[PDB]
Amino acid sequence: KLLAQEPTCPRDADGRPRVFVEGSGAYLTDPDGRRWIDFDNARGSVVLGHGDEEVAEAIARAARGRSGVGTAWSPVLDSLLGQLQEVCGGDVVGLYRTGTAALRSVTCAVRDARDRSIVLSSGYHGYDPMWHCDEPFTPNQHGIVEFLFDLDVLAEWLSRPEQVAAVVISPDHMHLGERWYTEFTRLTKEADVPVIADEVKVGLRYRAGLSTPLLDPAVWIVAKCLANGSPVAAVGGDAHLLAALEDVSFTSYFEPTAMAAATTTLRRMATGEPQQAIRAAGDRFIAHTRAAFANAGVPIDLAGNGNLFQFVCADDEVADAFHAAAAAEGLLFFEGDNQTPSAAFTDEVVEDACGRIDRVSAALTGRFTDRELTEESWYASAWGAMDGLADRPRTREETTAIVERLWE
Amino acid sequence: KLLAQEPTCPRDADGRPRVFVEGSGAYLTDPDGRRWIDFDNARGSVVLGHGDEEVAEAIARAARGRSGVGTAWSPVLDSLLGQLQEVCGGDVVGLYRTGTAALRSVTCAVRDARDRSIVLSSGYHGYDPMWHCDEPFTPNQHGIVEFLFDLDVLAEWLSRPEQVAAVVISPDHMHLGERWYTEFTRLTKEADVPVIADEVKVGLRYRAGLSTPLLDPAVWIVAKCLANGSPVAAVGGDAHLLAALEDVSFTSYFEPTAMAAATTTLRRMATGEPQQAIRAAGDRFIAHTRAAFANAGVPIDLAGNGNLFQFVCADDEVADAFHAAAAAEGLLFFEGDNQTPSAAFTDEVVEDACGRIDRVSAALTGRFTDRELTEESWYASAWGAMDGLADRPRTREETTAIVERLWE
């Protein structure tokens, strides 16, 4: 009753937030003492594991004033800014406390520098009202055009490039591939329109760098993979497009525990070693789960890879039964969205999660053996996770029909 | 050269950031080993003291997952929301990572609830471009009218009340008195326009509550005094005006170290004891300093009280000389803005600081003896610290003239 906001979090079947009282590594403990395996991981921001020792020791020293104070520039900030630039590229870098803040600030800065009114957008960019819209493919009141990753619509808007300030996309790699990114970049280069790569979720997710070399971003944003859940986002890119960032300052800019979490996490993420380990362990869990369901005739497949994957169910009913069965075994999934294991998802935890998937499979057998994975199932589950249209061959009339089905 | 932003921080006379390696209580240590007394305190967000051990212990435990994880609701959140509603009041509460984000979210929500386009504003509300304006007393492109705490301009805009969604003010108590607040509240009650009290700086600063009972805010925001520098801001007030906050969610919402810092700090700030101790200690420093300058012919006075005060210098040459002399003695002032001691500013620190101020006064004696504080000195100093016009008697044409001198 007290809380005016509606934060995204795991919720039970009746909509009330699931309470977890402690966590460590890959395991969460609920009030009754039951241990769950976390695949949500603070919506993908805990990439090293809950309570990671090295980060925790750095945070504790920073809370005791040993590595700088919030009053002033600290010795470690230069190394943070320098490594961000080495890993992600760009002329200049900037820092924020949320992805929402970073996305609003850089989009306004790029719009100002370009002196053009229209921004074309696909993917989620945060909660700020500037992104709200009543319908896709047309400007909202802030000049933003949602194009749902549809390149026919994008091509049309870019055929009048004079008025387009920038294209901002949150890249997805479960449902968009080489073909889509090659044509996206071809179109934007032809229009000479700068691209803002919103890599809040996928920046540093797959390797020590941005998510695909097929994109050529003028500006990038990363956050979830940067600080093991502490509130830090970073931006970088072309100096003239980010000129307006000179007016950005906020009180907690130099707060030392966030600085400790970001520097300690980035030094490790910049080696690529956590992403490689997560990839191997997650790949094993995916392969085990895919074969389990296929052998038991459960109509649920997987998209993505070990770093970032999602469940594709034939229908809503299937997804509901899956989610109840998963919860009963102590698997904590981000329901209808993407699963992002952390480095704490070791070989032993994989074994444990596979045993829990074995029991979910056994609890779903013979209930939905008839149902097929239709094109409708693939678009609906992709729409939940990457917030637009999957790259699957389709007619223009089919685009309209999908959007009519799925738009909120 | 890497940073695209210009964060507010102590800088030397050439504009380069002063670097500090470590801090404990009221003392900072610089790279050369010199100890400085901090009056800036992360722009007033460190109210207990750098490295406060009780907060550090709670942060360290939270960093190890001992009371919750960023994935999910936990009991620490229930207690925090309850503590906020108990100290500040209101129907509902919400949380943010910065004062800037909180102010933008509540202002948009209130404007949408009121279905009116004009917001009247005084004081600083954060870095977001929605507050940028070319001229005072006229609506910017977002419908916001800056009125610089001038109640004659406010009365003019409230004489046409039907299009005024809200009045948002950052209360000042160094240069605005009881008479200002009683007339402000009378005018806004008469127009039936809700008041948003931006108490990011002054909320809990002076007592265990908001800054003055002479305001009747429909919505309040606090931050600086909440978490000893960790990135937490809170809002609350009338449920119907904050209904759009149901759309607010962000990835780090459940981040446990920030919640640990806030619950621990707020528990101490809710007793009123830290603010009483700071008031007493800061008052002793102010009295000593005012007399040191006065008895040496140095044209520098002080405004405010022990919780929050500022220097008022005859002119900018005096202020520049004062700031250079202060840094030479290891006093770390928020230059040209307000000083906010922490609870680590104990009597032993007061005595040290008074000796340093004696040396500052000695360094300035004889340089500026023939200069005096004018009304222009008071308006210029107030403008830098509270971002509007001091409450001194003046006509409407004198207001225009002062603003023409000070508007940047």
Ligand SMILES: Cc1ncc(COP(=O)(O)O)c(CNC[C@H]2O[C@H](O[C@H]3[C@H](O)[C@@H](O)[C@H](N)C[C@@H]3N)[C@H](N)[C@@H](O)[C@@H]2O)c1O
């Ligand atoms: C790509 C991207 N850009 C910006 C942000 C905003 O960052 P902050 O949260 O730090 O401000 C994010 C945030 N990612 C959160 C999830 O967004 C989508 O899912 C839904 C959210 O769960 C919900 O809270 C929103 N109201 C709607 C949104 N569609 C993604 N499906 C999910 O994968 C993300 O974890 C970015 O991801």
Ligand SMILES: Cc1ncc(COP(=O)(O)O)c(CNC[C@H]2O[C@H](O[C@H]3[C@H](O)[C@@H](O)[C@H](N)C[C@@H]3N)[C@H](N)[C@@H](O)[C@@H]2O)c1O
């Ligand atoms: C009252 C108030 N509301 C909102 C904010 C924004 O909070 P966040 O910083 O967490 O986003 C603040 C912040 N206060 C910081 C200082 O602001 C003013 O000082 C100047 C700033 O330092 C500078 O960055 C700005 N460009 C201009 C601004 N005038 C206050 N004078 C200073 O006293 C504050 O400490 C609020 O204070």
